[PDB]
C-alpha cells in the first residue's frame, strides 16, 4: 500500500464534508475550522483564505470540532486530539471503546460524550496550563435520567456546571462534584439542536417538528416558542450585533431569520444548501457582527451579511434582507474527469457528476473558480433552442485542452453523456465557448482531441466517424470514416503530420493528416478502451479489453511493449512527462507504475477506493488521481 | 472609498450645524409661510410669537395641542439648540416632535397648523432631521399646495426617491406616482410602522384611511400579473389588515374590509387564512356600518375559494361566532334584497353548518334555500348531509319539509343522492 | 425564584487578582478573594456589560380572539393554496411543459391538415396533402410510429 515513488500530499477542492464547522476568535479576527474527511482545514473569516491544514490524517473520520483561541480540538473514534496551527500538541485517549460524539470545552474542563451516554471530564493539571490533559472523573447519564445526549453546552456565569441536552429533556451536571443539580421537564418532541443565547440562563432548543424553545434554566420554565411546521431544525444562532435576531437553519436547506423583539420574520433564504446533502448543517452568527457563516454537506461554505437599513427613521422595521457576501466550494459528487490546465502545476481542470466543471488551483485555494456555462449569442442571429428553466450541461466523459492559442479563441473540447455534439470552453475567460461540434453521423461523442497548434478539434463518434472542426471558426473541415464501431481514442503528433485512431472494433488506424491518406491499419486481439499519446517520444499506449496495455510506436506502426498484470478493467492511465513510465489504475483497487525500457512493473499500490483517473503533472513533480468516493482530488508527490 | 465620498458623509451629518453665514442663510431661509428673501431677515422671537398664537387656535379646536405649549412651544424653547444636545436629549426631543406631527396630520387644511409647524421647521429643523415623519403625515395632502411647499424645502430620503422630480415643480405629484412609492416593499414596511403608530394612538382619520386604502388597493392591481410579488405582499398588508380590524374605530375596520376583499380576488389563499380572516373580522364587529360591510366581505371571500372543502361546513367556533353577530333574521334580510352579491358558496357552507350544529334552525334552512338559487353540486352536498340527518336524527315535520322541497325542485337529483347513499 | 440550588457554589472561594480579566470584578482594592455566590453575581454583571439585556427576554413571555389572523400568518410560510388539490385551473397562469415532437420519429412531407387522438388508446393520427395517414404512439418521450397508410391520389383534408 506504500509506494516507493509516490506519497500523499493533500486533497484539492474539498472545503467541508458536512460535519458542523467550528468558529474561533483570535483577537478581533475570526477563523472557521471545517472537517474534510480525516483532516480539518482552517479558513480566515475575513477572506476565506486557507490558513492551516492538519499535519497528519487521523486514523478515523472526525466527528466533532471545537476551537478556542489558538487550540483546536478534534474528536475521532475514542480519542480526542488537541491541535495548534494544524500540528498535534496532545492526544486524549478515552478508556472505553464507545466512540466520542459531542465535545465541549469551558475553562479548564474538557467534556467528551460517547455514544453510550457517558461523559468524560478532563481537567488542567495546572491552572496556567494551556489545555486540559489530566483525567478528572466520569459522569454517565442513564436512561431513567434522560434520553440520548443531543449536545453538551455550557452557559455563561455558571460555576462548574455542564448543561447536558438529551432528546427527552435537559440536564444540569456539576462537573467538579459530578452530581445532577437540576433536571428539566420532559419535552413532547425530540430535541435536535441546542444553542446558548446571548442572554443569561436561556438556551435555545430546536425540536424535530419545527419548534424552537427559549428554555430558561434558572427558572426551569419555557419563555418562548417559535413554530416552523413541516421542518426540521439543524442549527440555531443569535445576532450579537445589538439586534435581537435569531437565525434558524433547517434540513430542507432554508435559513429563516426572526426578530425576537417584534415577533416577526425578517426574511427566509431558500435553498442556500442542498436538501439531499443535509441542508444547513451549521449556521453561526459571527460574534458582534452582522455576518452569518453557513455550511452544508454539499461541499460549500457561504457568508451572508445584513446591510444597514435604508430608512433614516425606524431602521428596526425596515430591515434589509441578507446579502450573499462570499463563499468557497467544490464538487458535490466525486469528479469524473481531471486534467492539468498548463505546463506548470498551477491549475487543474475538473468535471463531476454534479454537471459542473471547475478549475482548481494547486498553488492557492482562493484562485479556484467555476467556469461559467452562460452561452454566447448566436452568430447567425437565430434564437438558441433550449428550456427557459436553466439546467447545467450533462456529465463530462472526456476533455481535451491545449494552450497554443489561449486567449485567442476556444482551447478546450469536452464530451458529454448521451449527447451528439461536443462543447468548447475558454480557459482565459473561464466560460463556455461559442462553438459546438456535431458528429454528423447520428452517433454520440466518445473521443475528443486537439492538435498541438490549437487550430483543429477532433471528435470521435460512437458510429465510427471522425469529424475535424476548426476551433477559431467552428467550421467542419474534414471527415474520416474508417472505423465501423465507436472510436475510443484520437491523437495527433506534435508535427501535425501523422494521426492515429483506435476503436472498439480493435483496429488502430494511422492517417497522414496533411495528405489525408491511410498510412496503415493494425489489428489488435481485443477491443481498445483508451489511448494516451506521448508527443515527444511518438509512443502511445492502448488499454485493451483483455487487461493489457499495448505500447505502439507511431513511426513504425509496430507493438514495442505489452504490459500484463491487472486483474480487472483499466480505468485510466497516463504517461510520465519524460516518456519513461506509465502509471495505470484498474478496478481491482491498485495503481501500478510500469517502466517502459524494461517493460515491467516497478511499483504497486492498493487504494481503498478505486481510482477513476490518473494524471501526471507536465513537470512530473505531482501525480493527481480521483477516486469513486470523495469530492476532492488526491495529489501525490513524485519521490523519484 | 474615495476621500470625496467620505467627506460627503461628513457633510450630511453636520447639515444643520450653521458653521458660517452662508450655511445660516440656507438653513434659516427654509420656510412654509414666507419666501426665502423675507425668511432670512426674520428672527426667532418673531417666528415664535406667531406660532404661539397658532397653537392657541389649534388648542381651541383640540385640547391635546395644549400639551406642547409646555414642551415644544415654550418660551424656553427659543434658546434651545439641537446641535448642542446630547444623544439622550435628542431622542427624547424626537418623540415629542413625532407625536405633534400625528395630531397635526388631520388639521393641515386649517391655516394655523402651517404657522405652528413653522416654529418646528425653523427652530428644530424637522425638514432636515425628522424628514420621514413629516412626509408620511402629509402624504395624503399631495394635491394640496402645502405638500408642494414641503417638497421645496425638504431633502428627500432614499425611500421617497420618486418624488425628486416634483421637488420645486409647477405641477403637483400625480396620483399615479404615489402607487410607485407604495409599490416598493421597503416603503410598505415604513408606512406600515407609521400607520401602526396611529392605530396605537387612535389618531387615524377618514382622509388618511381613504388615501391609504387606494394606494394599497392599487398596489395589488399593479402586481396582479406578478404572482411571486403578490406572495411577498401577503405578509405585509394582511398584517396591516389585522391591526386595522383590531382598532375599535369603525372607519379603520371598513378599510380593512376593503383591503382583504381585493386580496382574495387578486390571489387565492388557503381556506385556513380565509377562516382566520373571519375570526378577526367578527371578533371586533360592533359598528352597524362595519357590520354591513363585513357581511359583504364574508360572502366575497368564500366566493374566491376554489378547492375541495369549498362549501364544507364552518368550524364549530366559527359558526357560533357568526350567528351571534349576524342572527338568522339578518341574513334572511341580506338574501331578501334583490341586489345581493353572489354568496351561494357561503350559504352552502352556512346551511351545512346549521344541520351539523343547530337542529332548531332546520326550518330556517327551508327559507334560506328558497331565497337563493344554489348551484347543482351545492344542492347535492346539502341533500347528502340531510340524508344522514334522517338516519341519525329523529324525523321531523320540518325535516321532511326540506326533502319535499327538493322533491318539488329537481326530483331526479334527490334520487341520485339516495341511490348513492342508501 | 431559582428552581434549583447548588451548594458547591457557596463553599467555593476563588482569587480575583491572578488573571488580568478577573481583576475588573473587584469592588475595592483591598479585597482579593471572594466566595462563589458573590463571584457569580459579579460575573453576571460583567456579562451584561458585554451583552445588554434585550426587551424580548424580560418583559415578554408566552407563558373570538382578534389576533387569530396574525397567528396563522406566523405559522404558514406559503400563502397560496396548493393547486394540486383544487380541480379548477388558475385563471391567468398556465402550467404547461413541452414534450418530444410527435412527428420526430417519422417526419411528414406536407402540412398536418388534421389531428385526432384516439378516444381510449394512446394514439395520435396525422394527415395531410402528402396523402398519408400516420399513427403515432404518444408517450411523451419517444412517440414511435405505430403504422402508416398511403392513399394514392387521395389528399387528406381531414
Amino acid at each position: 500500500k506504500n509506494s516507493k515513488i509516490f506519497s500523499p500530499f493533500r486533497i484539492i477542492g474539498n472545503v467541508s464534508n458536512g460535519v458542523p464547522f467550528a468558529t474561533g476568535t483570535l483577537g478581533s479576527t475570526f477563523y472557521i475550522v471545517t472537517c474534510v474527511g480525516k483532516t480539518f482545514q482552517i479558513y480566515d473569516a475575513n477572506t476565506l483564505h486557507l490558513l492551516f491544514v492538519s499535519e497528519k490524517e487521523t486514523p478515523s473520520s472526525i466527528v466533532a470540532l471545537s476551537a478556542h483561541f489558538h487550540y483546536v480540538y478534534a474528536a475521532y473514534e475514542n480519542k480526542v486530539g488537541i491541535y495548534k496551527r494544524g500540528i498535534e500538541e496532545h492526544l486524549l485517549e478515552l478508556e472505553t471503546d464507545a466512540n466520542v460524539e459531542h465535545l465541549c470545552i469551558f475553562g479548564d474542563y474538557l467534556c467528551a460524550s460517547t455514544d453510550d451516554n457517558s461523559i468524560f471530564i478532563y481537567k488542567k493539571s495546572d491552572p496556567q496550563d494551556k489545555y486540559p490533559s489530566e483525567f478528572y472523573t466520569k459522569l454517565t447519564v442513564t436512561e431513567i435520567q434522560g434520553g440520548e445526549i443531543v449536545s453538551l453546552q455550557h452557559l455563561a456565569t455558571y460555576l462548574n456546571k455542564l448543561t447536558v441536552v438529551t432528546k427527552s429533556n435537559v440536564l444540569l451536571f456539576n462537573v467538579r462534584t459530578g452530581k445532577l443539580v437540576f433536571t428539566s421537564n420532559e419535552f413532547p418532541d425530540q430535541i435536535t439542536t441546542a444553542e446558548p443565547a446571548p442572554v443569561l440562563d436561556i438556551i435555545a432548543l430546536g425540536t424535530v417538528t419545527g419548534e424552537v424553545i427559549m428554555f430558561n434554566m434558572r427558572k426551569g420554565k419555557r419563555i418562548r416558542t417559535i413554530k416552523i411546521p413541516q421542518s426540521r431544525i439543524s442549527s440555531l444562532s443569535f445576532r450579537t450585533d445589538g439586534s435581537s435576531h435569531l437565525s434558524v437553519g433547517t434540513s430542507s436547506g432554508d435559513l429563516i431569520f426572526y426578530d425576537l423583539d417584534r415577533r416577526s420574520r425578517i426574511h427566509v433564504l431558500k435553498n442556500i444548501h442542498r436538501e439531499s446533502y443535509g441542508g444547513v448543517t451549521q449556521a453561526t452568527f459571527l460574534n458582534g457582527q452582522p455576518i452569518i457563516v453557513t455550511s452544508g454537506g454539499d461541499n460549500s461554505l457561504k457568508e451572508y451579511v445584513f446591510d444597514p437599513s435604508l430608512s433614516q427613521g425606524s431602521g428596526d422595521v425596515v430591515v434589509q434582507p441578507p446579502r450573499y457576501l462570499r463563499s468557497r466550494g467544490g464538487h458535490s459528487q466525486p469528479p469524473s474527469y481531471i486534467a492539468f490546465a498548463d505546463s506548470q502545476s498551477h491549475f487543474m481542470l475538473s468535471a463531476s457528476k454534479d454537471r459542473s466543471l471547475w478549475s482548481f488551483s494547486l498553488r492557492k485555494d482562493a484562485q479556484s473558480q467555476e467556469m461559467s456555462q452562460r452561452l454566447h449569442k448566436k452568430q447567425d442571429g437565430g434564437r438558441v433552442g433550449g428550456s427557459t428553466i436553466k439546467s447545467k450541461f450533462p456529465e463530462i466523459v472526456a476533455l481535451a485542452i491545449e494552450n497554443a492559442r489561449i486567449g485567442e479563441w476556444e482551447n478546450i473540447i469536452t464530451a458529454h453523456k448521451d449527447e451528439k455534439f461536443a462543447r468548447t470552453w475558454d480557459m482565459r475567460n473561464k466560460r463556455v465557448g461559442r462553438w459546438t461540434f456535431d458528429t454528423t453521423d447520428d452517433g454520440f461523442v466518445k473521443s475528443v482531441a486537439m492538435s498541438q497548434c490549437g487550430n483543429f478539434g477532433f471528435i470521435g463518434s460512437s458510429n465510427g466517424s471522425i469529424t475535424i472542426y476548426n476551433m477559431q471558426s467552428g467550421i467542419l473541415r474534414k471527415k474520416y470514416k474508417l472505423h465501423k464501431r465507436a472510436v475510443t481514442g484520437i491523437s495527433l503528433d506534435g508535427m501535425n503530420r501523422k494521426m492515429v485512431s483506435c476503436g472498439l472494433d480493435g483496429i488502430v488506424g494511422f492517417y497522414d493528416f496533411n495528405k489525408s491518406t491511410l498510412l496503415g491499419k493494425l489489428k489488435l486481439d481485443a477491443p481498445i478502451t483508451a489511448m494516451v499519446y506521448h508527443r515527444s517520444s511518438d509512443l502511445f499506449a492502448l488499454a485493451l479489453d483483455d487487461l493489457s496495455i499495448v505500447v505502439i510506436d507511431a513511426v513504425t506502426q509496430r507493438v514495442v511493449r505489452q504490459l500484463w498484470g491487472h486483474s480487472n478493467r483499466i480505468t485510466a492511465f497516463d504517461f510520465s512527462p519524460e516518456g519513461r513510465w506509465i502509471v495505470s489504475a484498474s478496478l481491482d483497487s491498485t495503481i501500478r507504475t510500469w517502466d517502459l525500457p524494461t517493460g515491467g512493473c516497478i511499483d504497486g499500490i492498493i487504494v481503498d477506493n478505486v481510482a477513476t483517473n490518473v494524471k501526471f503533472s507536465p513537470n512530473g513533480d505531482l501525480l493527481a488521481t480521483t477516486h469513486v468516493t470523495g469530492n476532492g482530488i488526491c495529489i501525490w508527490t513524485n519521490r523519484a | 472609498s474615495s476621500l470625496s465620498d467620505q467627506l460627503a458623509q461628513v457633510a450630511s451629518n453636520n447639515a444643520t450645524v450653521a458653521l458660517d453665514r452662508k450655511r445660516r442663510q440656507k438653513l434659516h431661509s427654509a420656510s412654509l409661510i414666507y419666501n426665502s428673501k423675507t425668511a432670512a431677515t426674520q428672527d426667532y422671537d418673531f417666528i415664535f410669537e406667531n406660532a404661539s398664537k397658532a397653537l392657541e387656535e389649534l388648542s381651541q379646536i383640540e385640547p391635546k395641542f395644549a400639551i406642547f405649549s409646555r414642551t415644544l412651544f415654550s418660551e424656553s424653547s427659543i434658546s434651545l439648540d439641537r446641535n448642542v444636545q446630547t444623544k439622550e436629549e435628542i431622542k427624547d426631543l424626537d418623540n415629542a416632535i413625532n407625536a405633534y406631527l400625528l395630531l397635526a396630520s388631520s388639521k393641515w387644511y386649517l391655516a394655523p397648523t402651517l404657522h405652528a409647524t413653522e416654529w418646528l421647521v425653523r427652530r428644530f429643523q424637522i425638514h432636515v432631521k425628522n424628514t420621514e415623519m413629516l412626509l408620511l403625515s402629509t402624504l395624503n395632502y399631495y394635491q394640496t399646495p402645502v405638500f408642494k411647499r414641503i417638497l421645496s424645502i425638504i431633502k428627500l430620503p432614499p425611500l421617497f426617491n420618486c418624488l425628486s422630480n416634483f421637488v420645486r415643480s409647477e405641477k403637483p405629484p400625480t396620483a399615479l406616482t404615489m402607487i410607485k412609492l407604495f409599490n416598493d416593499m421597503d416603503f410598505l414596511k415604513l408606512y406600515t410602522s407609521y400607520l401602526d403608530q396611529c392605530i396605537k394612538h387612535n389618531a387615524t382619520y377618514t382622509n388618511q384611511l381613504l388615501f391609504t386604502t387606494c394606494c394599497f388597493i392599487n398596489v395589488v392591481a399593479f402586481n396582479s400579473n406578478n404572482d411571486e410579488k403578490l406572495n411577498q405582499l401577503v405578509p405585509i398588508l394582511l398584517e396591516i389588515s389585522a391591526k386595522l380590524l383590531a382598532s375599535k374605530s369603525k372607519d379603520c375596520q371598513i378599510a380593512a374590509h376593503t383591503i382583504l376583499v381585493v386580496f382574495a380576488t387578486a390571489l387565492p389563499l388557503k381556506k385556513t387564512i380565509i377562516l382566520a380572516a373571519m375570526e378577526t373580522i367578527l371578533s371586533n364587529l360592533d359598528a352597524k356600518e362595519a357590520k354591513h360591510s363585513a357581511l359583504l366581505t364574508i360572502c366575497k371571500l368564500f366566493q374566491t375559494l376554489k378547492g375541495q372543502g369549498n362549501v364544507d361546513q364552518l368550524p364549530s367556533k366559527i359558526f357560533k361566532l357568526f350567528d351571534s353577530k349576524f342572527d338568522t333574521v339578518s341574513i334572511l334580510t341580506f338574501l331578501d334584497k334583490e341586489d345581493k352579491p353572489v354568496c351561494d358558496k357561503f350559504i352552502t357552507s352556512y346551511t351545512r353548518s346549521i344541520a351539523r350544529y343547530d337542529r332548531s334552525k332546520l326550518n330556517i334552512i327551508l327559507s334560506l334555500l328558497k331565497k337563493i338559487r344554489l348551484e347543482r353540486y351545492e344542492v347535492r352536498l346539502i341533500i347528502t348531509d340531510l340524508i344522514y340527518l334522517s338516519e341519525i336524527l329523529e324525523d321531523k315535520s320540518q325535516l321532511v319539509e326540506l326533502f319535499e322541497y327538493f322533491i318539488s325542485i329537481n326530483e331526479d337529483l334527490v334520487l341520485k343522492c339516495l341511490k348513492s347513499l342508501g | 425564584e431559582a428552581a434549583w440550588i447548588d451548594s458547591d457554589d457557596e463553599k467555593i472561594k476563588v482569587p480575583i487578582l491572578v488573571t488580568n480579566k478577573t481583576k475588573k470584578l473587584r469592588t475595592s482594592y483591598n479585597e482579593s478573594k471572594i466566595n462563589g455566590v458573590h463571584y457569580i453575581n459579579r460575573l453576571r454583571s460583567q456579562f451584561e456589560k458585554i451583552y445588554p439585556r434585550p426587551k424580548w427576554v424580560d418583559d415578554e413571555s408566552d407563558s373570538g380572539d382578534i389576533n387569530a389572523l396574525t397567528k396563522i400568518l406566523s405559522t404558514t410560510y406559503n400563502y397560496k393554496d396548493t393547486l394540486s388539490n383544487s380541480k379548477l385551473l388558475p385563471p391567468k397562469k398556465l402550467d404547461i411543459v413541452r414534450l418530444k415532437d410527435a412527428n420526430a420519429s417519422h417526419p411528414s412531407h406536407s402540412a398536418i391538415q388534421s389531428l385526432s387522438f384516439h378516444p381510449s388508446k394512446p394514439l395520435l393520427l396525422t394527415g395531410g396533402y402528402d396523402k398519408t395517414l400516420r399513427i403515432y404512439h404518444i408517450d411523451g418521450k419517444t412517440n414511435h410510429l405505430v403504422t402508416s397508410l398511403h392513399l394514392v391520389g387521395s389528399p387528406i383534408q381531414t
Binding site: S28, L310 | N161 | T19
Partner: peptide
C-alpha cells in the same frame, strides 16, 4: 426614479466576548 439599492462595503469591527475561563473554580 425607483429606490436605489446599493450593496455598501462591509468591514469587520472588533467586539467584546465573554470568556468562559472565569467559570471554572477550584475548592
Amino acid at each position: 426614479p425607483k429606490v436605489v439599492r446599493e450593496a455598501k462595503k462591509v468591514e469587520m469591527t472588533e467586539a467584546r466576548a465573554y470568556n468562559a475561563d472565569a467559570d471554572t473554580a477550584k475548592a
